[PDB]
């Protein structure tokens, strides 16, 4: 549950994991 919006980078995770858990940020840079 995040706003889609910390999944640009090649590094998604530097952004993601500051208001969501690493299973979102899984799911943005690379997919699961």
Do not use: F, T
């Not at 208001?19 to 997919?31: D, K, L, R, T, V």
Request: net charge negative; aromatic share 6%; hydrophobic share 25%.
């Amino acid at each position: 549950s995040c706003g889609s919006e910390c999944a640009p980078e090649p590094d998604c995770w530097g952004c993601c994991l500051v208001q969501c858990a690493p299973s979102i940020c899984a799911g943005w840079c690379g997919g699961s």
